[PDB]
Design a protein around this ligand. Structure first.
Ligand code: A1A9S
Length: 167
């Protein structure tokens, strides 16, 4: 039993809700919140910009030190950093950005990072400003993640379509 509330159950391990991931994180304080990161950990817009803003830019300061030490992530890769005031940890995961020409096949690799954590709050990877079809992102999620994932989806019109079209 966990404190996630109001989710629809898609599968044995995947749950989905129309919600602002920032507001959800502040309520649940999950062990792991997933960020929709880029390889530079430059948290400008979308989920990343919103999470970082909610940390008063502390996420960005920490991320800049991470990059200065380790260099960029890989597309499909991830790193674990602090969750600041939002969660214990933030798993920064880089899905492919279709608007940068990156290989959508990398989306499965991106979701595989979730399997290293027993429970996560997360957005749909590569959706939104990363340019991929969110229906496809949900499918890859369900077919790749085996741990317990609570998906937030901020956009209301997007949520209803994802539920109604789910196979
Ligand atoms: C995946 C992605 C990345 C970048 C931009 C937009 C999206 C699409 C999703 C679904 O709507 N966005 C969000 N999902 C949950 N919590 C959110 N909080 C603020 C935005 C937001």
């Amino acid at each position: 039993v966990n404190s996630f509330s109001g989710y629809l159950k898609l599968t044995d391990n995947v749950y989905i809700k129309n919600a602002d991931i920032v507001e959800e994180a502040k309520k649940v304080k999950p062990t792991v919140v997933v960020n929709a990161a880029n390889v530079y950990l430059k948290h400008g817009g979308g989920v990343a910009g919103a999470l970082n803003k909610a940390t008063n830019n502390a996420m960005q300061v920490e991320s800049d030190d991470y990059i200065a030490t380790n260099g960029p992530l890989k597309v499909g890769g991830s790193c674990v950093l602090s969750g600041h005031n939002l969660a214990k940890h933030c798993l920064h995961v880089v899905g492919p950005n279709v608007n940068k020409g990156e290989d959508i096949q990398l989306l499965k690799s991106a979701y595989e990072n979730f399997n290293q954590h027993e429970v996560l709050l997360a957005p749909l990877l590569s959706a939104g400003i990363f340019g991929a079809d969110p229906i496809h992102s949900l499918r890859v999620c369900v077919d790749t993640v085996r741990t317990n994932v609570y998906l937030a989806v901020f956009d209301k019109n997007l949520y209803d379509k994802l539920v109604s079209s789910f196979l």
